[PDB]
Design a protein around this motif. Sequence first.
Motif, PDB file in Angstrom:
ATOM      1  N   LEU A   1      62.112  70.008  36.221  1.00 19.70           N
ATOM      2  CA  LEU A   1      63.314  70.652  36.738  1.00 19.70           C
ATOM      3  C   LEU A   1      62.977  71.780  37.706  1.00 19.70           C
ATOM      4  N   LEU A   2      62.020  72.623  37.326  1.00 22.80           N
ATOM      5  CA  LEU A   2      61.598  73.735  38.172  1.00 22.80           C
ATOM      6  C   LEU A   2      61.124  73.243  39.533  1.00 22.80           C
ATOM      7  N   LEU A   3      60.383  72.140  39.537  1.00 26.15           N
ATOM      8  CA  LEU A   3      59.893  71.558  40.780  1.00 26.15           C
ATOM      9  C   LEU A   3      61.036  71.002  41.625  1.00 26.15           C
ATOM     10  N   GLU A   4      62.095  70.538  40.966  1.00 26.62           N
ATOM     11  CA  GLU A   4      63.279  70.063  41.674  1.00 26.62           C
ATOM     12  C   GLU A   4      63.937  71.199  42.444  1.00 26.62           C
ATOM     13  N   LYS A   5      64.063  72.347  41.787  1.00 20.81           N
ATOM     14  CA  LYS A   5      64.763  73.487  42.364  1.00 20.81           C
ATOM     15  C   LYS A   5      63.936  74.156  43.459  1.00 20.81           C
ATOM     16  N   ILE A   6      62.614  74.119  43.310  1.00 21.63           N
ATOM     17  CA  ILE A   6      61.722  74.614  44.354  1.00 21.63           C
ATOM     18  C   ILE A   6      61.832  73.720  45.585  1.00 21.63           C
ATOM     19  N   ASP A   7      61.877  72.411  45.352  1.00 20.40           N
ATOM     20  CA  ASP A   7      62.085  71.439  46.420  1.00 20.40           C
ATOM     21  C   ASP A   7      63.395  71.709  47.150  1.00 20.40           C
ATOM     22  N   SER A   8      64.438  72.005  46.383  1.00 20.48           N
ATOM     23  CA  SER A   8      65.761  72.257  46.942  1.00 20.48           C
ATOM     24  C   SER A   8      65.807  73.583  47.693  1.00 20.48           C
ATOM     25  N   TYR A   9      65.005  74.543  47.244  1.00 18.14           N
ATOM     26  CA  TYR A   9      64.962  75.858  47.873  1.00 18.14           C
ATOM     27  C   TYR A   9      64.347  75.768  49.266  1.00 18.14           C
ATOM     28  N   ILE A  10      63.223  75.066  49.366  1.00 20.85           N
ATOM     29  CA  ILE A  10      62.549  74.878  50.645  1.00 20.85           C
ATOM     30  C   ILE A  10      63.404  74.036  51.586  1.00 20.85           C
ATOM     31  N   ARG A  11      64.028  73.001  51.036  1.00 20.01           N
ATOM     32  CA  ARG A  11      64.853  72.097  51.827  1.00 20.01           C
ATOM     33  C   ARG A  11      66.057  72.818  52.421  1.00 20.01           C
ATOM     34  N   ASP A  12      66.817  73.498  51.568  1.00 19.70           N
ATOM     35  CA  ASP A  12      68.069  74.121  51.986  1.00 19.70           C
ATOM     36  C   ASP A  12      67.882  75.496  52.625  1.00 19.70           C
ATOM     37  N   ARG A  13      67.294  76.425  51.876  1.00 23.07           N
ATOM     38  CA  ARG A  13      67.226  77.822  52.296  1.00 23.07           C
ATOM     39  C   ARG A  13      66.269  78.074  53.461  1.00 23.07           C
ATOM     40  N   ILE A  14      65.292  77.192  53.647  1.00 20.41           N
ATOM     41  CA  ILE A  14      64.269  77.417  54.666  1.00 20.41           C
ATOM     42  C   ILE A  14      64.330  76.416  55.821  1.00 20.41           C
ATOM     43  N   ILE A  15      64.225  75.127  55.509  1.00 24.75           N
ATOM     44  CA  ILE A  15      64.164  74.100  56.547  1.00 24.75           C
ATOM     45  C   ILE A  15      65.519  73.839  57.204  1.00 24.75           C
ATOM     46  N   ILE A  16      66.503  73.428  56.408  1.00 29.41           N
ATOM     47  CA  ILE A  16      67.831  73.119  56.934  1.00 29.41           C
ATOM     48  C   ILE A  16      68.469  74.352  57.562  1.00 29.41           C
ATOM     49  N   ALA A  17      68.340  75.490  56.884  1.00 34.05           N
ATOM     50  CA  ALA A  17      68.840  76.755  57.406  1.00 34.05           C
ATOM     51  C   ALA A  17      68.227  77.052  58.768  1.00 34.05           C
ATOM     52  N   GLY A  18      66.928  76.796  58.891  1.00 32.81           N
ATOM     53  CA  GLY A  18      66.223  76.988  60.143  1.00 32.81           C
ATOM     54  C   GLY A  18      66.753  76.086  61.241  1.00 32.81           C
ATOM     55  N   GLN A  19      67.031  74.833  60.893  1.00 32.62           N
ATOM     56  CA  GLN A  19      67.587  73.875  61.844  1.00 32.62           C
ATOM     57  C   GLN A  19      68.932  74.355  62.374  1.00 32.62           C
ATOM     58  N   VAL A  20      69.775  74.835  61.464  1.00 35.29           N
ATOM     59  CA  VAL A  20      71.097  75.335  61.821  1.00 35.29           C
ATOM     60  C   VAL A  20      70.994  76.525  62.768  1.00 35.29           C
ATOM     61  N   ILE A  21      70.085  77.445  62.458  1.00 33.47           N
ATOM     62  CA  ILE A  21      69.849  78.610  63.303  1.00 33.47           C
ATOM     63  C   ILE A  21      69.443  78.196  64.711  1.00 33.47           C
ATOM     64  N   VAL A  22      68.515  77.246  64.799  1.00 36.24           N
ATOM     65  CA  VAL A  22      68.017  76.767  66.085  1.00 36.24           C
ATOM     66  C   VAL A  22      69.141  76.225  66.963  1.00 36.24           C
TER      67      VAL A  22
END
Lengths: 317, 349
Positions: free
Chosen positions: B124-145
């Motif tokens: 479960l912890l690995l799921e949420k870490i995966d989701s954190y990088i995906r949403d808060r960092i990568i996707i968020a970065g795409q939106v900013i760009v």
Amino acid sequence: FDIVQVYKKFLQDDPEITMPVAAIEALVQLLSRSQAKTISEFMDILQNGSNTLKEGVQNNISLSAGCDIFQRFVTRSLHDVGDFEQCKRHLVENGKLFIQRARACRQRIAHLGYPLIRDGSVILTHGFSRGVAAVLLAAAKRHVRFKVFVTESRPSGSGCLMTRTLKNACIPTCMVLDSAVSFTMNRVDLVLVGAEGVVENGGLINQIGTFQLAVFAKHAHKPFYAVAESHKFVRMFPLSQYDIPFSRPILEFDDPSPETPTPSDAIHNELIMNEEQIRNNPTLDVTPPEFVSGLITDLGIIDSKSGVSEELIKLYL
Amino acid sequence: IFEEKQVSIFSHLDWRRRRTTENIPKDIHPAVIRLGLKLANYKIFGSNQRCIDLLKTFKIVIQDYQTPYGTTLSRHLTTHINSQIAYLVSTRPLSISMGNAIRFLKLEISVLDIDLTDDEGKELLLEKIDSYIRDRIIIAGQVIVQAATEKIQDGDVILTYLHSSTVNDVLIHAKNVGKKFRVVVVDSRPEFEGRVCLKLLTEHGIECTYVMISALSYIMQEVTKIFLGGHAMLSNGALYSRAGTSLISLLGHESNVPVIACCESYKFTERIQLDSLVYNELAPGDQLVNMGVDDFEEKPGVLANWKSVKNLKLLSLKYDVTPPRLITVCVCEMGLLPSTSVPAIINEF
């Protein structure tokens, strides 16, 4: 003798004259027709004559400056074992040879001013000024590529005259409303205005929309240069940008008792104020020296503006 | 304990680093060791990239973590990671991004259901870490760009400072979609990260101009827009980024140039700094020693012995705090917002 009638007389006589100089010529041709011959008689004279002159024209600042210069030249060489008459002829003799320099002062200004305009810059000016025009034209002959925004200057409407003046010299122009001056500041590289008079602290007395331009210029970080001849320096110290002798009563209100839609794109030129209302609005404003980058004169470009004070200090003793 | 704060203004700043694995604790995971070495020895390693590598490392740490007989998984995993953190901190002070992701991970561990078996807990912890990088960092970065490249008009002259992955990706994407513009890359000492940027931008065929921060006044008269990549946004709206970023914003203000700060929301912090000295990061003063336009190429400097010299101290701060009144807009995944909306966005989680 109706000095006033005369003073107005030059003004129409010669578009290139300045209100201070016109007052100096006034006093001269009074000093010609002046029987006098008592210093008491000799100096009682104009003072009632510039006084009469000052009371005869409603906005009197500029002519007061030309006045102030005249008498200080009078008493300073009437001091000195001063005989009257030699100054009386010498003033009447060289009266033609006064509106010589006055005209040479403006050209000196233009020769100092025009390098402030450099290739590919956009200038903004408010209303019509002979000095500003002189600077702009002098730059144009040197084949300098520049364009000029001109404010529709209500109430005087001087914007039209200045626009056409600059159009004749093949200078690209564009007129802006008094309400749109702020929106244009980002496209402006330099702001250039004239002045009817320059007060003790180096502040400008000019057309009613002047200070607003200086305000927008300061806010937009753009240079604001004033163009005025040295004989526009007057010893008077306004304590605010509101403190000047008023010709007519001003900005007073209605007194209604139970007395019995517009889009922004809409252009209603028939929806302006009437002249009865306009006579309730000021004719001039005051621009503090902290809004003036440099003050172009025949004495050179004065940036200190404790220096305009320095000159008025020298004028009086 | 270090308590002695003396006259020097920089005295409170922590200067102790760990560049090697000498006398390392035995409870440090191999993945953490490698990250720790990369942390204190890399030179261009984005705050985003730091956080991503940290979370991916913690994934390996958690995956290989086997809970002891002396505790349940919830209570002791936080202890084990606390050890990994303390070691990482010793190599180099935590970035705001890393600190925020750590608070996130620690939280989810404490809210772990006890009825879960250890393998379900780790999964479960690995799921949420995966989701954190995906949403808060990568996707968020795409939106900013995309949101930031939107503001680039044809004919613009975009100023950038140092090496910002966010700003870089915005400029590159602008070039790709067909925006016609050019870029002013402003660089600085002791380390010319702007050349890394200049290389990346020129490799993508983007027209560029390269100057030092001292030439800011000169080159500012050509700039139409300023784009800044942030380390963190303060809760008062202030921008916490590298070095001379405040100087870029200050001179940018005097020339009526819009200052655009691009920062992912996960790098928003609740901290509010009034000056740039209270929370910063010291860089080795030896970097300032050799000066002739290169980092390691060697020829003796006049200040080589500055440590031995009395009253002669060298230092280079890595960050400063740009006041909120100098920032025009903050571009995040939530869209273009006034920088004072940072604490509001925080509550929205």
